[PDB]
Nucleic acid binder design. Structure first.
Ligand SMILES: Nc1nc2c(ncn2[C@H]2C[C@H](O)[C@@H](COP(=O)(O)NP(=O)(O)OP(=O)(O)O)O2)c(=O)[nH]1
Ligand SMILES: [Mn+2]
Ligand SMILES: [Mn+2]
Ligand code: NA
Ligand code: NA
Length: 326
DNA sequence: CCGACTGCGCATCAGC
DNA sequence: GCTGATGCGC
DNA sequence: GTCGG
C-alpha cells in the first residue's frame, strides 16, 4: 500500500477500459502497470520516476503526475459522473455479467440492483446465481475460514476415493491472510495425459460435496472444471457464514506441477511468466511447457518434475508461492 | 514507427 | 446434431 | 497503453 492511490487509479482505469471501452489490451496495460508499481519499494514522487518501470509509458506517467499534484484524476472524475459508465461498471460486478451483457442490459433500462431482481427471467443461470449472492461474493474469506473449508474438501474427497489428491491453490497457497474465493486442484491416478480410465472423476467429487451441503450452487460444470458456490456449516443459534465462490480444476496426475503453478497464480504473475517464456522461446499452459520451433509452432512437452523445473527452462530463479503475489 | 499483447474451460449462439 | 466464434471467467 | 524490433 506504499502507492495505494496510484495503483487504485490504474486499477480503476483498467476496469473502465475492460467494462466500458471493451479494449482488453488497455485493460491489461493498466493491470501490468499497476502490478509493477505495486511491488516497487519506494514512495513514488513523480511520473518520470515511475516511467522508468517496465510497463509504465508516457500516458500513464502524465496521469501519475496529475494524481500526485491534485490528489485525483480528472479523467476518472468524469467517468464517475457518467451515468452509462457507472451503470455498466455496476452490472459487471455480478458474476456471469460481462461488458457485453451489461451494456445490453443498460440498453433495456436494467441498470440497478432493483432492476435485476424484477427481471431475473432475463438472466441466464450463472447470472441468476451471481445476483443471488451479490452481497456474499463481495465479502472476503478470512484464512481461518479457508482452513475450515480445506478440512472439509480434503476429507470429503478422501471418502469418495483415497487416491484423490486435493490441493487448495490460488491466493491461499500464496499465504494470503484473506482470500476472495477458494481454488482447488484435483488429481486422481486414473486421469493422465495418456488416458481417462475412469469417467465422472470430477462429478463424483461435486456430487459428494453437495451431499454434505457444502457445495450449494453451480455456475458451470464439465469434465475437468467446476464453477460454483459453497458454504461452511454454522453452529447452533449463530448467523450463517456468507456463501463463497469455489473453483475446482481436475488436471492430469502427471501434469500436476504445470497445473499447480498455473492455479496458484497470481493471474498477472502467470501473464508475466508466460510472456517471459515466449521471449525465451517457450510456451507454458496449465499442462505443459513446450519449446517453439523455427516456425513458432510448439514442440513436444519437455520433462517437468517440480515447479522449479519450469522456472529453470525460462531462466527464472525459483519464486515461492508467497512471492508470486503480483 | 508498429505489430503483438498468456492460455484455456464452460456456456451460448451462429451457421450448416 | 457438429463446428467455430463469442462471452465470461479461471 | 506499452514496448521490442
Ligand atoms: N494463466 C492465467 N491464470 C489465471 C488467470 N486468472 C486466474 N488464473 C489462475 C491463477 C489464479 O491465481 C488462479 C485462481 O484464480 P482466482 O481465484 O480468480 N484469483 P486468486 O486466487 O489468485 O485471488 P483471489 O484470492 O482474489 O481469489 O487461476 C489468467 O488470467 N491467466
Ligand atoms: Mn482464488
Ligand atoms: Mn477462483
Ligand atoms: Na517504462
Ligand atoms: Na462479472
Amino acid at each position: 500500500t506504499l502507492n495505494g492511490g496510484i495503483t487504485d487509479m490504474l486499477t480503476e482505469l483498467a476496469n473502465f477500459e475492460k467494462n466500458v471501452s471493451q479494449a482488453i489490451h488497455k485493460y491489461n496495460a493498466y493491470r501490468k502497470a499497476a502490478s509493477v508499481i505495486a511491488k516497487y519499494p519506494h514512495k513514488i514522487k513523480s511520473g518520470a520516476e515511475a516511467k522508468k518501470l517496465p510497463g509504465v509509458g508516457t500516458k500513464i506517467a502524465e496521469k501519475i503526475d496529475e494524481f500526485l499534484a491534485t490528489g485525483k484524476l480528472r479523467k476518472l472524475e468524469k467517468i464517475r459522473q457518467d451515468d452509462t459508465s457507472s451503470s455498466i461498471n455496476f452490472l459487471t460486478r455480478v458474476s456471469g455479467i460481462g461488458p457485453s451483457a451489461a451494456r445490453k442490459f443498460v440498453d433495456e433500462g436494467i441498470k440497478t440492483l432493483e432492476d435485476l431482481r424484477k427481471n431475473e427471467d432475463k438472466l441466464n443461470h450463472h447470472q441468476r446465481i451471481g445476483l443471488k449472492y451479490f452481497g456474499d461474493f463481495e465479502k472476503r474469506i478470512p484464512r481461518e475460514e479457508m482452513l475450515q473449508m480445506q478440512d472439509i474438501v480434503l476429507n470429503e474427497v478422501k471418502k469418495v476415493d483415497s487416491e484423490y489428491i486435493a490441493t487448495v491453490c490460488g491466493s491461499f497457497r500464496r499465504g494470503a491472510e484473506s482470500s476472495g474465493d477458494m481454488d482447488v486442484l484435483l488429481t486422481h491416478p486414473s486421469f493422465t495425459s495418456e488416458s481417462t480410465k475412469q469417467p465422472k472423476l470430477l462429478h463424483q467429487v461435486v456430487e459428494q460435496l453437495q451431499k454434505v451441503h457444502f457445495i450449494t450452487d453451480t455456475l458451470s460444470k464439465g469434465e475437468t472444471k467446476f464453477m460454483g458456490v459453497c458454504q461452511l456449516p454454522s453452529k447452533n443459534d449463530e448467523k450463517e457464514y456468507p456463501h463463497r465462490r469455489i473453483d475446482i480444476r481436475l488436471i492430469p496426475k502427471d501434469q500436476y506441477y504445470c497445473g499447480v503453478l498455473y492455479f496458484t497464480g497470481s493471474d498477472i504473475f502467470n501473464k508475466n511468466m508466460r510472456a517471459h517464456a515466449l521471449e525465451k522461446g517457450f510456451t507454458i499452459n496449465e499442462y505443459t511447457i513446450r519449446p517453439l520451433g523455427v516456425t513458432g509452432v510448439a514442440g513436444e512437452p519437455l520433462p517437468v518434475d517440480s515447479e522449479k523445473d519450469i522456472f529453470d527452462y525460462i531462466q527464472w530463479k525459483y519464486r515461492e508461492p508467497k512471492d508470486r503475489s503480483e
